[PDB]
Amino acid sequence: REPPVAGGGVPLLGHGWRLARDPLAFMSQLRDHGDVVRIKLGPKTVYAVTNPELTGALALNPDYHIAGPLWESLEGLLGKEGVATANGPLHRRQRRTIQPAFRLDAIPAYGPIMEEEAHALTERWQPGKTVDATSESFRVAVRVAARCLLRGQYMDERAERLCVALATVFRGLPANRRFNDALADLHLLVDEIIAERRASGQKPDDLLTALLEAGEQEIHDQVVAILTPGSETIASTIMWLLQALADHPEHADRIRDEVEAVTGGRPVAFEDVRKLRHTGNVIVEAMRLRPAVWVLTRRAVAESELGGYRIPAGADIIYSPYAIQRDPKSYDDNLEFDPDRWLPERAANVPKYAMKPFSAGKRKCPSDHFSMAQLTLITAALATKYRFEQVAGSNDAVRVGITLRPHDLLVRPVARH
Numbered sequence: 135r136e137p138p139v140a141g142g143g144v145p146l147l148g149h150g151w152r153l154a155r156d157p158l159a160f161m162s163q164l165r166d167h168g169d170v171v172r173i174k175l176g177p178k179t180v181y182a183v184t185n186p187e188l189t190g191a192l193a194l195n196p197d198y199h200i201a202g203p204l205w206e207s208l209e210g211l212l213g214k215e216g217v218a219t220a221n222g223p224l225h226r227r228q229r230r231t232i233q234p235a236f237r238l239d240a241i242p243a244y245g246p247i248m249e250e251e252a253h254a255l256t257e258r259w260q261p262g263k264t265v266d267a268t269s270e271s272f273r274v275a276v277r278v279a280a281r282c283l284l285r286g287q288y289m290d291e292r293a294e295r296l297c298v299a300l301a302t303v304f305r306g307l308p309a310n311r312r313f314n315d316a317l318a319d320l321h322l323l324v325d326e327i328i329a330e331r332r333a334s335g336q337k338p339d340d341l342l343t344a345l346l347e348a349g350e351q352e353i354h355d356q357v358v359a360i361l362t363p364g365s366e367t368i369a370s371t372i373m374w375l376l377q378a379l380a381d382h383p384e385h386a387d388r389i390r391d392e393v394e395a396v397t398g399g400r401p402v403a404f405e406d407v408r409k410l411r412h413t414g415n416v417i418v419e420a421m422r423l424r425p426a427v428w429v430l431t432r433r434a435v436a437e438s439e440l441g442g443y444r445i446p447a448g449a450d451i452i453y454s455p456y457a458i459q460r461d462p463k464s465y466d467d468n469l470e471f472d473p474d475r476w477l478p479e480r481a482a483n484v485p486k487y488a489m490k491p492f493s494a495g496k497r498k499c500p501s502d503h504f505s506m507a508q509l510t511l512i513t514a515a516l517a518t519k520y521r522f523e524q525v526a527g528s529n530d531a532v533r534v535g536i537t538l539r540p541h542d543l544l545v546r547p548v549a550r551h
């Protein structure tokens with residue numbers, strides 16, 4: 135048993151500084167300091183795990199509750215700020231309720247709405263007019279998510295707006311003015327929306343009905359908790375996908391050939407996605423280099439041992455899938471965009487947990503199936519009808535926030551055939 139090694143920072147704010155000047159680099163640097171190192175952001179210490187294996191151990195071990203200190207500092211506030219009181223403490227139990235709505239079985243029924251949201255974009259974006267990625271990706275997001283996870287009365291541009299005016303408050307404890315007119319409205323709306331399905335919610339397999347079949351304000355809190363993160367994430371995701379279709383014409387058109395073969399001409403549909411291999415490979419390779427979620431935290435319940443190191447109980451640990459997915463030691467062409475490094479042969483070349491956009495423990499992403507489905511749909515629909523090109527002056531330099539998104543990605547759909 136050996137306690138972790140330290141890294142290197144300043145007085146009152148140890149690593150709290152290097153991290154400040156550039157988080158993403160600090161996560162990657164930390165990789166060589168030891169399999170698990172200790173770092174100090176000011177007075178308190180956290181532990182970082184920089185090895186795929188230990189990070190998988192880390193997720194697959196039920197001994198790590200997720201108060202995760204530089205997450206629950208906001209989650210204690212998310213107890214008013216967002217989600218509401220908590221988020222998956224223990225028991226879970228009253229939380230398997232969610233699985234039935236996100237399983238591989240309940241996604242093909244969302245398929246139509248998914249197809250519909252995609253092709254719609256397709257007529258929405260027209261060649262020549264640059265697409266505003268931040269405002270627009272954030273939209274198909276809401277729409278898809280809300281529209282499949284709830285059905286009937288449309289929250290259309292109303293839900294979007296609020297979350298928008300919302301998401302922007304985070305970048306640059308809670309806030310000042312219009313973030314207000316958006317919040318109450320976000321809650322005003324979610325409630326109003328629970329009230330309505332109460333009418334005739336028969337077959338609705340979505341999350342709302344299953345959530346109406348398991349607390350009074352506990353439902354108004356679990357939707358606002360599932361809909362919130364999952365949207366900004368499927369969004370940031372979309373964003374990097376746009377940069378992808380615009381940055382590697384090759385695969386973009388390659389993605390258009392794959393779609394035509396299988397689809398023939400008919401607009402892409404859930405059945406097809408399950409066929410479009412290259413379409414998903416693109417989506418994955420992109421998510422590896424530019425994930426939306428780049429750090430993940432936990433809070434040990436019991437004094438642990440990891441990679442032979444002693445993890446003090448009650449401790450607070452942190453890891454970076456960002457870094458992991460971009461670790462040389464884990465990948466050959468470390469920074470090379472290559473949708474084909476996911477080819478069966480090279481695929482096994484890559485460590486077990488060196489690529490898991492979502493995680494493995496019960497703190498996993500219920501929409502793994504749900505996401506890739508709408509993303510693959512959305513990737514295929516766009517690449518097929520267009521070809522994306524990035525407006526000069528476009529700013530695709532990363533902005534490190536809740537998730538990793540492009541400060542100002544500007545692209546123009548061009549007409550393909």
Ligand code: HEM
Pocket residue numbers: 193200221222279359360361363364365367368369371426427430431491492493496497498499500501504505
């Ligand atoms: C852009 C694709 C997505 C990625 C990469 C992703 C990733 C993740 C990760 C890494 C976690 C939690 C890991 C942890 O703390 O242990 C998570 C949790 C979660 N995600 Fe996603 N997600 C995506 C899309 C979505 C969507 C579309 C929804 C639903 C609208 C969603 C809903 C959730 C929920 C409710 C949780 C909390 C799980 C828990 O309490 O353990 N996610 N996601």
Ligand SMILES: CC1=C2CC[C@H](C)[C@]23CC[C@@H](C3)C1(C)C
Pocket residue numbers: 157204205429431534535536
């Ligand atoms: C201030 C901040 C954080 C608090 C800890 C949490 C992991 C993070 C680490 C860097 C990200 C997320 C930002 C900049 C949003």
Ligand SMILES: CC1=C2CC[C@H](C)[C@]23CC[C@@H](C3)C1(C)C
Pocket residue numbers: 362363364367426427428429536537
């Ligand atoms: C994956 C993820 C989340 C799951 C829900 C939780 C509130 C969040 C919402 C966005 C933040 C925290 C990140 C991106 C780390």
